[PDB]
Design an enzyme around this catalytic site. Sequence first.
Site, PDB file in Angstrom:
ATOM      1  CB  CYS A  98      51.617  28.893  41.140  1.00  0.00           C
ATOM      2  SG  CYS A  98      50.896  30.294  40.235  1.00  0.00           S
ATOM      3  N   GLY A 123      45.106  26.596  40.517  1.00  0.00           N
ATOM      4  CA  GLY A 123      45.403  27.329  39.299  1.00  0.00           C
ATOM      5  C   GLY A 123      44.148  28.063  38.863  1.00  0.00           C
ATOM      6  CB  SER A 126      50.888  33.413  42.703  1.00  0.00           C
ATOM      7  OG  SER A 126      51.814  32.875  41.831  1.00  0.00           O
TER       8      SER A 126
END
Lengths: 352, 352
Positions: free
Chosen positions: A137, A278, A311
């Site tokens: 990520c 996230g 990501s």
Amino acid sequence: SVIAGVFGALPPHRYSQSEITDSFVEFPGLKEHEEIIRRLHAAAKVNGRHLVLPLQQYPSLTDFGDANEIFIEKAVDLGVEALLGALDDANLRPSDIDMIATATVTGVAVPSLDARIAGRLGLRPDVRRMPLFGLGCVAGAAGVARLRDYLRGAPDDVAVLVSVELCSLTYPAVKPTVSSLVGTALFGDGAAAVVAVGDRRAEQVRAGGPDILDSRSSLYPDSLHIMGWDVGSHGLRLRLSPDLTNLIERYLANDVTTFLDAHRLTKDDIGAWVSHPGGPKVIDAVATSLALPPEALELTWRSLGEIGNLSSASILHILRDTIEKRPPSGSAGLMLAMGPGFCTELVLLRWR
Amino acid sequence: SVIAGVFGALPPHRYSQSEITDSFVEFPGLKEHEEIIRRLHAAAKVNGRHLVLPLQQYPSLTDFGDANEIFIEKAVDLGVEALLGALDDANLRPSDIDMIATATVTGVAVPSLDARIAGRLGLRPDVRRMPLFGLGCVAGAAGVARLRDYLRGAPDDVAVLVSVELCSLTYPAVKPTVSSLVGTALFGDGAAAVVAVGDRRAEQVRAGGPDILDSRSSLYPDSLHIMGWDVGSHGLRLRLSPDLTNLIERYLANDVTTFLDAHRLTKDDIGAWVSHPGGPKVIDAVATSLALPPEALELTWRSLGEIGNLSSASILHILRDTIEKRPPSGSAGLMLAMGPGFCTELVLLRWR
Ligand SMILES: *C(O)[C@@H](C)CCCCCCCCCCCCCCC
Ligand SMILES: CCCCCCCCCCCCCCCC(=O)O
């Protein structure tokens, strides 16, 4: 170095979070975990996601070979669509590219994506190739930093970053374990490209997007386990620790301040934050630890809800989104990403 | 950019080629092919290879998940050994490393090897990480070129390349198949690190290794099939086409000629050739296409026979062998590599 074009590309199949959850609960081996799946999908604050495969095709995606093959077929054309879009945003051509960085964590391609994309788009045979795999990520911010790092010594060059993340295609490794289900609630498919350009080349191409001023990577000690894949016969299985949130709150402000002090800057001196999502707890964490107002992460929350966690390509979608917002001219932009390492990556931007 | 250290690490277990063949042809589902296996092994001109596992663990390495986990652990130990070694050759310390690039094609690690070796060696939390994957065999040459490409925008810095290839660990994916059997005759285990240093840093550091002058990638059109991984539930399976030799014989000359013309050099001007030891048929094709004397590729023939094909790591061992033998002071050095793409990388060196 200065960004001349950004461009996010998504597969055309867009599904509601509801449509995805409703169908997903009915997938083989999953109905039993409906409660937690709905919980997790609802709590994810993702309202919809683009998928590279028709939603109902996923139950048949049990083989890592098939999945990774579809990945290579779909990653490249999502990648070239992304690249072309950024090439045209920069009003540049494939031949103009001197180096191509490729970022993916969600598929294994040898020959790499850059090789195949360069084949498709007819890049000069001597394009410099940088296939980044295992940044995860963090690769959107990090990829942008690596372009700076390249263009820093090549002022006439055009360097592109193409991120493709086809999270959906890791389905073969997905089981009803909570970490895999967390990921099943947040991650969607999508590509994005950044066309960057050297300082000298900048005036020639009328380079629009922000100047990439500096970056600071921050690798956290003894944190391999926080994030990444457990790679196996069933493919790429998400490892994701609950400890992650507490790493952010403990240490992110430290990374963000040490990096910003290096530039005679403060939290308040930055005009648009460009943050990787996230998921909501993560976004809350960086918002909380950096003492961020609601507005500062709104784009990354909006991007979260529109297309989910892509990501690497996420931060490049919200970067494209924040560019369209046209933030204050000459104002500091701050890319912040994080991923397997565990690490964080700050990229100092300057907008036009 | 200037090379300050070159170090080659191998696993302690060394086995003769005859040792390997004799035990390999008794592995499950292979005695049916013992003829072609012994033919491929003998033709390989490898006399011995270092294996990261005892020769008699391999038949039990049927699971990709197992093989990949061992890869990660072993590749970080081997990785750090080679870096420590190259750091010692450079008389430099882990804290000095400003960017670390890692090259592997024989395992998948998220977080990447550079993340893990950085944590093991206590590299500064702000090291710039470049985990290249999917360059394959070309990554030793291209890795050096990337180093150069980084150090050319950061002249005061130290950048390292750590190549770790544990080819033997791709075993779960080998089938009694010419291509995979060719792999089993050629490929061995090992790592290497190069410590290169920016121009403004070379004098203080006393870098003694060769200058890195330039590089040219040659990405051939329509050549994906030439070399790569078939990736699936059994792991990384070698795709290797027998058009390879013919590709080289037809295009290699023009690659080096087009590159050497850019420096106004002919093949006669190259004081030392640092060629990737793909295999005897490839080394023949290189020498034939470039009209080279048998002394030019001797060091690479010798690596091949001693250590086998270490994928990206071989051209780095050979580069160390070359520096050892000490080429004429100030003469041209050409690193020559080929990897999945299909591509070629030439790096121009100047000996000291
Ligand atoms: C960032 O740090 C890295 C680890 C990003 C990795 C990507 C995670 C993928 C999660 C797996 C599940 C995805 C399923 C999507 C939903 C499809 C519906 C059937
Ligand atoms: C007893 C085990 C002996 C060694 C077995 C080796 C099996 C084949 C390994 C092939 C490695 C290929 C590495 C990448 C080549 C490339 O694509 O660049």
